[PDB]
């Protein structure tokens, strides 16, 4: 099945009668508009393109506007693609809503994780710190050794080092869909999902289940 694009509103809880507090991320799933149907002939794979939301007419560029105008849809904030599994058909101009998640039980959510900038080894890789005292000279959270001695004679690739952490695509899988609210354009997903409040989310049904 395809998935839908939404927005991170924030987190809340759903109390149940039985006494359980369920943490939920609220995903605003406005109606997704099909802007391009790629098919096996002209494109080489079967997917749909979607937009959602709104952008200024004054901030849409002419290349973007023709692409929206060809589809007969209003310019949304971005373009996202979803592959099709050989039975699901779609048409340009078709508006897909959060009701698609009505019968699904678990969803995978992907977003851009919160960015931590230049992160040290301790934070980025769970590197254990060295002794705070007991002689330590300027080497409290430094990474220690980064290799061997005159046999590789180099640092191997993929060595866990300090650098950019977060601000990257992250998918969290198999998240229970707590509630689908079609009239208010909301998906409720049990638990945290990646990224900051106000950030673009892609929600698909769970591959594994």
């Amino acid at each position: 099945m395809i998935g839908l694009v939404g927005k991170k509103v924030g987190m809340t809880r759903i109390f149940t009668e039985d006494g359980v507090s369920i943490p939920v991320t609220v995903i605003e799933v406005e109606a997704n508009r099909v802007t391009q149907v790629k098919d096996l002939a002209n494109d080489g794979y079967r997917a749909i393109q979607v937009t959602t939301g709104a952008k200024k007419a004054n901030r849409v560029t002419k290349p973007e506007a023709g692409h929206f105008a060809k589809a007969g849809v209003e310019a949304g904030r971005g373009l996202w693609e979803f592959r099709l599994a050989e039975g699901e058909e779609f048409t340009v101009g078709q508006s897909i809503s959060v009701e698609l998640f009505a019968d699904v039980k678990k969803v995978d959510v992907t977003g851009t994780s919160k960015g931590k900038g230049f992160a040290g080894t301790v934070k980025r890789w769970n590197f254990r710190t060295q002794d705070a005292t007991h002689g330590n000279s300027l080497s409290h959270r430094v990474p220690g050794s980064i290799g061997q001695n005159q046999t590789p004679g180099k640092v191997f690739k993929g060595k866990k080092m300090a650098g950019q952490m977060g601000n990257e695509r992250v998918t969290v899988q198999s998240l229970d869909v707590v509630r689908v609210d079609a009239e208010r354009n909301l998906l409720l997903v049990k638990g945290a999902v990646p990224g900051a409040t106000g950030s673009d989310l892609i929600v698909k049904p769970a591959v594994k289940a």
Binding site: P152, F156, K157, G158
Partner: protein, 142 residues
């Protein structure tokens, strides 16, 4: 007088089609490297690609002798420690058939830019169809 050197502005390269069905990989690969290099030409100048363009069809049906279909192992390294990756001949034929003849021919060509340049004139295809009909390529039996 000084001996002739080909000039790559005036060098003429002809287009040839080859079928790879049933043909020994190594025996076939050698003739392509010969022709890709320009050794078959009297105007052979080894710092000049005097060679010819060749299309190879039916790379998926190149033949090998012995138990090499199952036991010839293509090794490559990724550049990541432990990243020694394997693929037999039949797994390659299954996944990227055009690579089996391209790897053999690249090994037989010179190493360096001109060798890298000679290799560009080889166009390998897994099937019996190519899209270079405009180049008017001649049949060539190896």
């Amino acid at each position: 007088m000084k001996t002739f050197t080909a000039k790559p502005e005036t060098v003429k390269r002809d287009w040839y089609v080859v079928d790879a069905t049933g043909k020994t990989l190594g025996r076939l690969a050698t003739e392509l490297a010969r022709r890709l290099r320009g050794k078959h030409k009297a105007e052979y100048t080894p710092h000049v690609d005097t060679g010819d363009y060749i299309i190879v069809l039916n790379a998926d049906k190149v033949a090998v002798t012995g138990n090499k279909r199952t036991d010839k192992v293509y090794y490559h390294h990724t550049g990541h420690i432990g990243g020694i990756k394997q693929a037999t001949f039949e797994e390659m034929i299954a996944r990227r058939p055009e690579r089996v003849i391209e790897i053999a021919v690249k090994g037989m060509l010179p190493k360096g830019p001109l060798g890298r340049a000679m290799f560009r004139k080889l166009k390998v295809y897994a099937g019996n169809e190519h899209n270079h009909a405009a180049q008017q390529p001649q049949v060539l039996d190896i």
